[PDB]
Design a protein around this ligand. Sequence first.
Ligand code: HEM
Ligand SMILES: *[C@@H]1O[C@H](CO)[C@@H](O[C@@H]2O[C@H](CO)[C@@H](O[C@@H]3O[C@H](CO)[C@@H](O)[C@H](O)[C@@H]3O)[C@H](O)[C@H]2NC(C)=O)[C@H](O)[C@H]1NC(C)=O
Ligand SMILES: *[C@@H]1O[C@H](CO)[C@@H](O[C@@H]2O[C@H](CO)[C@@H](O)[C@H](O)[C@H]2NC(C)=O)[C@H](O)[C@H]1NC(C)=O
Ligand SMILES: *[C@H]1O[C@H](CO)[C@@H](O)[C@H](O)[C@@H]1O[C@H]1O[C@H](CO)[C@@H](O)[C@H](O)[C@@H]1O
Ligand SMILES: *[C@@H]1O[C@H](CO)[C@@H](O)[C@H](O)[C@H]1NC(C)=O
Ligand SMILES: *[C@H]1O[C@H](CO)[C@@H](O)[C@H](O)[C@@H]1O
Ligand SMILES: *[C@H]1O[C@H](CO)[C@@H](O)[C@H](O)[C@@H]1O
Ligand SMILES: *[C@H]1O[C@H](CO)[C@@H](O)[C@H](O)[C@@H]1O
Ligand SMILES: *[C@H]1O[C@H](CO)[C@@H](O)[C@H](O)[C@@H]1O
Ligand SMILES: *[C@H]1O[C@H](CO)[C@@H](O)[C@H](O)[C@@H]1O
Ligand SMILES: *[C@H]1O[C@H](CO)[C@@H](O)[C@H](O)[C@@H]1O
Ligand SMILES: *[C@H]1O[C@H](CO)[C@@H](O)[C@H](O)[C@@H]1O
Ligand SMILES: *[C@H]1O[C@H](CO)[C@@H](O)[C@H](O)[C@@H]1O
Ligand SMILES: *[C@H]1O[C@H](CO)[C@@H](O)[C@H](O)[C@@H]1O
Ligand SMILES: [Br-]
Ligand SMILES: [Br-]
Ligand SMILES: [Br-]
Ligand SMILES: [Mn+2]
Length: 299
Amino acid sequence: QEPGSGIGYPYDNNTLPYVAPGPTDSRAPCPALNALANHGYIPHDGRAISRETLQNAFLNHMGIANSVIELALTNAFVVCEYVTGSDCGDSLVNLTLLAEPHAFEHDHSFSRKDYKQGVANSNDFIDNRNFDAETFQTSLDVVAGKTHFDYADMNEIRLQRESLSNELDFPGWFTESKPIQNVESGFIFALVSDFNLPDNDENPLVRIDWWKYWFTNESFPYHLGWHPPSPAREIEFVTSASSAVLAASVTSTPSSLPSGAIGPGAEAVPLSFASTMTPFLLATNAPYYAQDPTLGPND
Ligand code: HEM
Ligand SMILES: *[C@@H]1O[C@H](CO)[C@@H](O[C@@H]2O[C@H](CO)[C@@H](O[C@@H]3O[C@H](CO)[C@@H](O)[C@H](O)[C@@H]3O)[C@H](O)[C@H]2NC(C)=O)[C@H](O)[C@H]1NC(C)=O
Ligand SMILES: *[C@@H]1O[C@H](CO)[C@@H](O[C@@H]2O[C@H](CO)[C@@H](O)[C@H](O)[C@H]2NC(C)=O)[C@H](O)[C@H]1NC(C)=O
Ligand SMILES: *[C@H]1O[C@H](CO)[C@@H](O)[C@H](O)[C@@H]1O[C@H]1O[C@H](CO)[C@@H](O)[C@H](O)[C@@H]1O
Ligand SMILES: *[C@@H]1O[C@H](CO)[C@@H](O)[C@H](O)[C@H]1NC(C)=O
Ligand SMILES: *[C@H]1O[C@H](CO)[C@@H](O)[C@H](O)[C@@H]1O
Ligand SMILES: *[C@H]1O[C@H](CO)[C@@H](O)[C@H](O)[C@@H]1O
Ligand SMILES: *[C@H]1O[C@H](CO)[C@@H](O)[C@H](O)[C@@H]1O
Ligand SMILES: *[C@H]1O[C@H](CO)[C@@H](O)[C@H](O)[C@@H]1O
Ligand SMILES: *[C@H]1O[C@H](CO)[C@@H](O)[C@H](O)[C@@H]1O
Ligand SMILES: *[C@H]1O[C@H](CO)[C@@H](O)[C@H](O)[C@@H]1O
Ligand SMILES: *[C@H]1O[C@H](CO)[C@@H](O)[C@H](O)[C@@H]1O
Ligand SMILES: *[C@H]1O[C@H](CO)[C@@H](O)[C@H](O)[C@@H]1O
Ligand SMILES: *[C@H]1O[C@H](CO)[C@@H](O)[C@H](O)[C@@H]1O
Ligand SMILES: [Br-]
Ligand SMILES: [Br-]
Ligand SMILES: [Br-]
Ligand SMILES: [Mn+2]
């Protein structure tokens, strides 16, 4: 928000306004990076981004500690080198390259389509990067009529997304990615679980309105009473939440799940790509921004 607004106070004492991305700005497949860029906490153009820029932006503006993004930073820079063909040093070339498929970006996202979702021909690909309202509605439908949801509900949401994606993706494309997705499941609990409930750390419940505002608007739900978690969330919370999601008993089983979907997931580790492997072409779509309604500087 505008710095003088005080909307972030006393959790964020140095806010900057929301500014929609323009057609030449680079955006990510990540709702967090996109919100940061929209506020200029990382470059508004989404280009030339250092590790420390990311660390400070997450810590000071989202209540997300450095530990939470240590592996994400490693993976971002691995993917930058893979996509561009050269070491990116400590200047991430842009955010858009993070949507390189079957890499850091993965299938069965909560709010993005898959790279070969619903394509008629094998060489086709689509926008697997920008927020997609219909896809996100398939996630939200699992918790329809509710204000909050728990680990078991999140497990059901990701299973629904895996089912749909395995059915809809071009044959042979779908590749399950429980380790990365469920770090992201943990990120959702870390950012938008309801810290106003007494037992949030033992038993976090996502506020659906906060989640929907963050994802749809790629800005922060201050108007709904959200603020950055304080103290900042640490990695322990995120991987515990990830494990709890996958450990939760499944009471409704969609059809068409890949083998081993129900059960624990592997620990996330650094990505690596063969030097001979050429990257898949990135989707070239202009960055998404919310239009129904458009957002003002304080939204
Ligand atoms: C350097 C830091 C980060 C990098 C490089 C990064 C990168 C990415 C990438 C590549 C994806 C796409 C995965 C896919 O859905 O196919 C993604 C998704 C996601 N990210 Fe980030 N991320 C970072 C930090 C965070 C943090 C700290 C949060 C929240 C606390 C966050 C929340 C999410 C969520 C919830 C998704 C899933 C979106 C969906 O499934 O629709 N990310 N991120
Ligand atoms: C974010 O950075 C990535 C990585 O640099 C950009 O993707 C790459 O964009 C370049 C154009 O600047 C593409 O190069 C072109 O490739 C075609 C086919 O190989 C070639 O015939 C052209 O002469 C040109 O070299 C490159 O393909 C593309 N990389 C991938 C994997 O798709 C991306 O455009 C940047 N996005 C933003 C919004 O800044
Ligand atoms: C996206 O952000 C807009 C702007 O903040 C949201 O619309 C406003 O919501 C706030 C509460 O968050 C209300 O006080 C305003 O009356 C709303 N204004 C307008 C112009 O509608 C919108 O709800 C957000 N989208 C989602 C899905 O959360
Ligand atoms: C991205 O741009 C490519 C051309 O550079 C197209 O071949 C791709 O289909 C893709 O097009 C989409 O996004 C561009 C902006 O980059 C729009 O101009 C297109 O209409 C389309 O939405
Ligand atoms: C915001 O400023 C107030 C008033 O000085 C201070 O008490 C509080 O600790 C500050 N918050 C942060 C995150 O520094
Ligand atoms: C989440 O999982 C990690 C291991 O991946 C632990 O280090 C952490 O304490 C939490 O259990
Ligand atoms: C790891 O931490 C999470 C988040 O605090 C808990 O919900 C979980 O039960 C485990 O203790
Ligand atoms: C990972 O951690 C979660 C949260 O403690 C457990 O529920 C799960 O069984 C696994 O150990
Ligand atoms: C069985 O229970 C889980 C959560 O406990 C739900 O998410 C599911 O919809 C079914 O009711
Ligand atoms: C229980 O929930 C699962 C996952 O959302 C559905 O696929 C199933 O049809 C039932 O509603
Ligand atoms: C749906 O079905 C699967 C196996 O058929 C179970 O693992 C799950 O708990 C749910 O009953
Ligand atoms: C979230 O984190 C847990 C614990 O490391 C994994 O088991 C899961 O697959 C996901 O990466
Ligand atoms: C990471 O691992 C891959 C193997 O999958 C190698 O190709 C790469 O060079 C790096 O060692
Ligand atoms: C977002 O931008 C639109 C332009 O379409 C305005 O009409 C709206 O009031 C908001 O500022
Ligand atoms: Br660029
Ligand atoms: Br489809
Ligand atoms: Br796994
Ligand atoms: Mn994806």
